[PDB]
Paper text:
Here, we identify a PPi-dependent kinase belonging to the ribokinase family, which is distinct from the families of the previously reported PPi-dependent kinases. This analysis demonstrated that TM0415 utilizes PPi but neither ATP nor ADP to generate myo-inositol monophosphate. In general, the overall structure of the ribokinase family enzymes is divided into two domains: the phosphate-acceptor-binding domain (the N-terminal half) and the donor-binding domain (the C-terminal half).
We thus also determined the SO42–-complex structure, which possesses only the sulfate ions and myo-inositol in both molecules in an asymmetric unit. The sulfate ion is well superimposed on the distal phosphoryl group of PCP in a protein molecule that crystallographically corresponds to the PCP-bound chain described above. The contribution of R229 to the reaction was confirmed by the fact that an R229A mutant exhibited only 7% of the level of the wild-type activity.
Numbering used by the authors: 1 to 80, 87 to 285
The structure:
Amino acid sequence: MITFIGHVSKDVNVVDGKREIAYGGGVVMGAITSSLLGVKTKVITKCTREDVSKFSFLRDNGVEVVFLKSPRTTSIENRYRESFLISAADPFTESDLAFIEGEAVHINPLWYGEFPEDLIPVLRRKVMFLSADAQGFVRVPENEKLVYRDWEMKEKYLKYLDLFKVDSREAETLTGTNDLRESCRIIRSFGAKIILATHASGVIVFDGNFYEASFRSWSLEGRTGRGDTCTAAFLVGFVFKKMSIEKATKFAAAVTSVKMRHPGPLRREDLEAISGDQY
Ligand SMILES: O[C@H]1[C@H](O)[C@@H](O)[C@H](O)[C@@H](O)[C@H]1O
């Protein structure tokens, strides 16, 4: 089993000045992927009681969800890649981790402060395989605008993580370099045992050696949730299906590719468009 911990979000997507609402967040995209890939999946999240029915579809995709109490629901405005934290559910606290079970937990936050760094060592004691998304540690609200800032305590906390996920913009923020491979080498030197890096054309996994796989389909409206889908697929392949790291990398790319053909989370039919020849 895998547990995803993170805020759900009312996304306000603004396309050429047109507002369109989507009910998402990183945990939605990742949890649906792992569940549809056949791994028992749990989500620990927060939102208002009134908004719980917006996220009921997690359960229809096989995901067990703990909807913890919050007086607000996270809402992020995305302008088209500029995002703003309009409203914020309450952060996670230590006691929210009390029931943690299963082999794997992915720390999947939308904004720095959602998942206080103090929770990292606490959670480490409870789980065999612990991963986190850099978005939760570098994307910082500043008069709402989510700005990219270096994660000051990265060298303290990266040693706690079996896997660390970044995308291009995160990796550059952490390292000063837009060379993605080199940033992987730098982030490894900070304590990261395995780094999963997504970028426009594909995914790079680095554990001392590089493994790469390219995406083979895409759409503009399907690109949101790329990285969360890819992370969840990699965790499924590597942690639960016992694929080699090279094979899990190709698998993660393959699953992400088919999800990117449409808006919203992975769909079961997407999996039929993968060939086993790929990975
Ligand atoms: O990865 C994206 C990104 O964090 C967006 O800014 C957020 O609004 C979406 O919920 C998330 O899925």
